[PDB]
DNA sequence: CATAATAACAATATCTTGATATTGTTATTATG
């Protein structure tokens, strides 16, 4: 329980914003900075509650998801400045109704998605383009292609992936590689944090490994390698968004616009269509090749958004 | 006038059962 501390990263993002050529003012980070500053020397729990009530009063008219994210930022700032043993962490949090409502909305959306699958008609063309991206010299393209072939998150692919050959007896497997650098684990006890596990690929392993070798040994590749989430989000996110938008404009399902993370979803689908053993469940296989938490089958529910045209045909044939 | 750069604004999917870490989209800035 310290009374002193400073959220270093936030203030750094503030001072790196004063001499910007253009762009929004870091008003939220200012809010947080003044918050942490006002927290210095505070031992009056009531006044802490008043401060947080002020901060909450500020977020009004903003989306619930947005408010939740902001609260996450605040809590991480408090943890950075004062530590995990600070009473404010039990004050600076959203009311339970907000989280319960968010969960309800999430479950509702997932249910609706399972009730109305999107037929990925031109998925072979998408996998083909994504295969062609592996032979490009542009690190961005190679990254997109690696997302497509390995089903790793953009953050994983560009920043912290560790692809290595997977043994197949004495030789080397053709349709599987080893992966290390799982994200969003939060260093869970039963997660793939720092765990090298085997994943299937949608092309021959040699091509993937070679393309990734050309990725890491590039300039932009070593700029990306080891980045934080915010660095990458500010560096590549919009460019990646536009590039992905253009790459799969007229082959992507008409219902939705082509987003990068979709390449993961799709991946799983076809990864289940061409590699899945008969003694496992689709949920189990998804949770296996995606590197989900131990004994978790509920996260896999979020990836079942598409359906392959062949399966659609084999289900239409029911007459 | 005007289009590029930036962080607000927002939603998703993961570990966990109340939140965090990601991915995704838009309003606002300086500036020239």
Answer whether A241's CB lies under 8 Å from A142's CB. no
A190 touches strand B (CB under 7 A): yes
Q: Helix axis angle, A8-15 relative to A27-39, nearest 10°? A: 140
Q: Nearest nt to A262, CA vs C1'?
A: B23
Answer whether A120's CB lies under 8 Å from A269's CB. yes
**First vs last C-alpha separation in chain A:** 70
Rounded-to-10 torsion of CA A60, A63, A65, A70? -40
Rounded-to-10 torsion of CA A270, A147, A258, A225? 160
Question: What's the reported resolution, in angstroms, to a tenth?
Answer: 2.5
In angstroms, the Cα distances linking A104 to A97, A108, A109 are 10, 6, 9
Q: Which domain holds residue A205?
A: 93-319
CA atoms within 13 A on the CB side of A127: 21
Q: Nearest nt to A156, CA vs C1'?
A: B22
Are A97 and A80 in the same domain?
no
CA of A84 to C1' of B6 (A): 31
What phi and psi values does residue A286 have, to the nearest 5 degrees?
-60, -50
A106 touches strand B (CB under 7 A): yes
A73/A115 Cα distance (integer angstroms): 34
What phi and psi values does residue A307 have, to the nearest 5 degrees?
-145, 135
CA of A84 to C1' of B20 (A): 14
Are A116 and A212 in the same domain?
yes
Q: What is the CATH classification number for the domain harbouring A233?
A: 1.10.443.30
Nucleotides of B under 7 A from a protein CB: 4-16, 18-32
Are A271 and A143 in the same domain?
yes
Are A175 and A47 in the same domain?
no
Q: What determination technique applies here? A: X-ray
| Residue whose pair of structure tokens reads 């003694």 in the numeric block | A279
Of A92, A108, A126, at which residue does a domain stop?
A92
A11/A8 Cα distance (integer angstroms): 5
Strand partners, A307: A119
Nearest alpha-carbon partner for A221 in A135, A145, A142 = A142
A256 touches strand B (CB under 7 A): no
What phi and psi values does residue A292 have, to the nearest 5 degrees?
-75, 175
How far does Cα A308 stand from its chain's mean position?
24
């Amino acid at each position: 329980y310290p009374k002193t501390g400073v959220a270093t990263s936030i203030v750094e993002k503030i001072e790196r914003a004063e001499f910007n050529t253009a762009g929004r003012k870091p008003t939220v980070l200012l809010r947080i900075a003044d918050f942490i500053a006002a927290m210095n020397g505070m031992d009056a729990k009531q006044d802490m509650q008043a401060l947080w009530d002020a901060e909450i009063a500020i977020m009004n008219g903003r989306a619930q998801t947005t408010i939740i994210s902001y609260i996450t930022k605040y809590r991480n700032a408090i943890r950075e400045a004062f530590g995990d043993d600070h009473p404010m962490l039990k004050i600076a949090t959203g009311d339970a109704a907000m989280y319960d409502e968010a969960r309800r909305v999430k479950m509702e959306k997932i249910a609706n998605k399972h009730g109305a699958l999107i037929t990925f008609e031109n998925y072979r063309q998408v996998l083909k383009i994504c295969e062609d991206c592996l032979k490009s010299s542009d690190p961005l393209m190679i990254g997109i292609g690696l997302i497509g072939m390995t089903g790793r998150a953009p953050y994983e692919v560009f920043t912290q992936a560790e692809f290595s050959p997977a043994p197949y007896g004495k030789g080397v497997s053709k349709w599987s590689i080893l992966f290390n650098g799982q994200a969003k684990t939060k260093q869970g006890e039963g997660t793939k944090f720092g765990i090298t596990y085997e994943i299937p690929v949608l092309t021959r392993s040699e091509t993937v490994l070679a393309a990734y070798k050309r990725l890491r040994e590039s300039g932009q590749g070593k700029l990306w390698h080891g980045m934080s989430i915010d660095d990458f989000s500010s560096e590549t996110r919009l460019l990646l968004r536009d590039t992905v938008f253009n790459l799969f404009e007229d082959v992507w399902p008409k219902e939705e616009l082509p987003k990068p993370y979709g390449l993961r979803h799709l991946y799983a689908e076809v990864a289940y269509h061409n590699f899945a053993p008969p003694h496992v469940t689709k949920n189990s296989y998804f949770a296996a090749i995606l590197g989900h938490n131990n004994n978790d089958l509920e996260t896999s529910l979020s990836y079942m958004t598409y359906t392959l045209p062949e399966d659609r045909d084999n289900a239409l044939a029911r007459l």
